[PDB]
Amino acid sequence: MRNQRFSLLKQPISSTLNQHLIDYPTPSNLSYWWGFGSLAGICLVIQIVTGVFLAMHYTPHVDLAFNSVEHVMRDVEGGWLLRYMHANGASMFLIVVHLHIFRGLYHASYSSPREFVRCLGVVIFLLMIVTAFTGYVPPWGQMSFWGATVITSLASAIPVVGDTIVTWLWGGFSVDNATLNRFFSLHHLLPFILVGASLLHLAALHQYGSNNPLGVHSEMDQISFYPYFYVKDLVGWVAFAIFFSIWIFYAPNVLGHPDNYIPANPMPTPPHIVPEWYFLPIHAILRSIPDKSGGVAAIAPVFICLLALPFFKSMYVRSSSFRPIHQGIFWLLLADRLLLGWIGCQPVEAPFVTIGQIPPLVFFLFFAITPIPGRVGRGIPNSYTD
Amino acid sequence: SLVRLLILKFVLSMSASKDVLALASLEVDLSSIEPGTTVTVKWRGKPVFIRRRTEDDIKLANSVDVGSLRDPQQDAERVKNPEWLIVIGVCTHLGCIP
């Protein structure tokens, strides 16, 4: 309070915006790797605005769905821009979030006191996967039918209530009009849960502030968010919109499959069923197990060892700048997630059955050889001392 | 009890409709082909597979190890004919037609 007024940004109507978006204290040495988080909140707003206008011309019926998407591309004013922004915009939303996650692994941003910020973001990554999968079915092409068949039948290897799971998810005995109608209703709903879980994920970071490239206690050198990290975030929103415009105007079909331009026929099978590029690493782990019930049970330990990183303790050094051995393991895990994506679009044959079984093992040896440096490393100040 | 009534009524409406269950059993016909080829015909929403395999196929077919099977059973019981094999065309693995 004071006795009379002052700057209007310090009034109750704009206090929550002032103290969290203008005057918020920030470490002064943050690099451009701290810019991909506001870039991911712009990619979520683009998908909501473009999809609300796409849904004014789409019909969720098996006799009318493929022809409603060609009606947008051909007869609606600017309608080809509305579709290409939405199909390619889901690839931009996954490039930005994948570079966000690998920042937090290099600088160990999951550590104390920031465990709830990590665990709220593993829930966000799960809501993004369900939303993109369920929305790839509405165009109703040959890859929108034979991809919803391969994934929803994978719940038929669960013990002995699982044959009642798949025919309740389907609404019948196969993928058909009962399945296309309920996949549309859930697809309008799940982006609005994703919005409320992103505002909650930001209230958990504004309780302790941000980490920095050195990993240290930083409260002695801090500046404000406006104008310093607003004008260098604006350099990032313009470099993004150039890169996004070479995918809409000059190459709008490079990141897709041609088989989704054939209308859906349940009598023949396509020769090769391959997902979008951003589902290729978990598709190669899922096909690496020669048992099917052990394939669903290798996807759930991917999201268990992610949710259980910030609860191992003894590591006082955070940043990989001062840690020369864990830094070399980071570049050796990134080479493995790019090799698991290559395997996930190859035939299931030799030699890709051995080269697709070792990288699922190397991927799970990253989360077990982290805590052993949490033991051998804490005896460094008693040995190297001078 | 009020939480019991509401949650069950929202989850049971997703199960299967009375018009989907009315199309679940019926009788349809096929045509002829020669020994060792393939043609399918539709029943409800999925195919009906097909084989009448040849005399070279009486070998490499049934006398392979019974203890090396994921589920061991004789060939003589899945067949009902000594050379024909035609049964509902959906793989038991993931619902794909192979």
């Binding site: 013990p159 002995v160 209530v161 009642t164 | 019991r4 949650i7 069950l8």
Partner: peptide
């Protein structure tokens, strides 16, 4: 004391089974 803490706490595991089949009758399993 501390035994009676768990000697209580494992019957809410079972108050929850009188409850877990109370509405759904999970049948096949």
């Amino acid at each position: 004391i501390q035994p009676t803490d768990v000697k209580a706490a494992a019957m809410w595991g079972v108050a929850a089974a009188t409850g877990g089949l109370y509405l759904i009758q999970p049948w096949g399993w």
